[PDB]
DNA sequence: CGCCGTGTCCCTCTCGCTGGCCTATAGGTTAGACTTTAAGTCAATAC
């Protein structure tokens, strides 16, 4: 499940490329800790093999799951609550959630949203926030790099 | 009704120098140009 040079997805940080596994023996259990690098934070995070999937680090994820994104971008006929603050509590848990679809279909809303007549500043930070995640996930997805992660999403999202 | 202990308040000189969250509504304000008017100006003239 895990080998040494994947680029595993760890969330949220996106993108986490993996350097080695460490016995770091506690409590007399040499538990192994897997250890992740991320080049957005430059932060190492160790993570227990065993548990490694309850936290939710998942692998690069396959064609399937990019034509599925392509396809909810272009779902249409969403309505949100009249409220903004349950909204923003709505999209701000579905970032959290990790789930790719959820944050991609937030970016997407927010985006078109945004687009559409301007917004504010918060979520203006968490469109940002996302759509880097977003890019940072499809530029592995596909080794398409960011640069030109950042203009597949560009030109997808005009549909 | 005295003596004692504790808490509180006021005082502690004069002069001088250098520098260190977000959204939606309703209402008031001003700026900017248009139109009017009192105001400043020039040219010729007569005594």
Known sequence: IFKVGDTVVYPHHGAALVEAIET????????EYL???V?????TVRVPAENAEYVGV?????????????QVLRAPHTEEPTNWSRRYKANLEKLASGDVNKVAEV????????????????EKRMLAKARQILVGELALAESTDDAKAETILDEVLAA
């Open 58 to 70: 998942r692998d690069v994820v396959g064609q399937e799951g990019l034509d599925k994104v392509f």
């Open 35 to 37: 250890v992740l690098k």
């Open 24 to 31: 770091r023996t506690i409590k007399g259990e040499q538990k």
């Open 107 to 122: 970016v997407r809303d927010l985006w078109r949203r945004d687009q559409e007549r301007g917004l504010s500043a918060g």
């Open 39 to 43: 080049a957005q934070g430059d932060l």
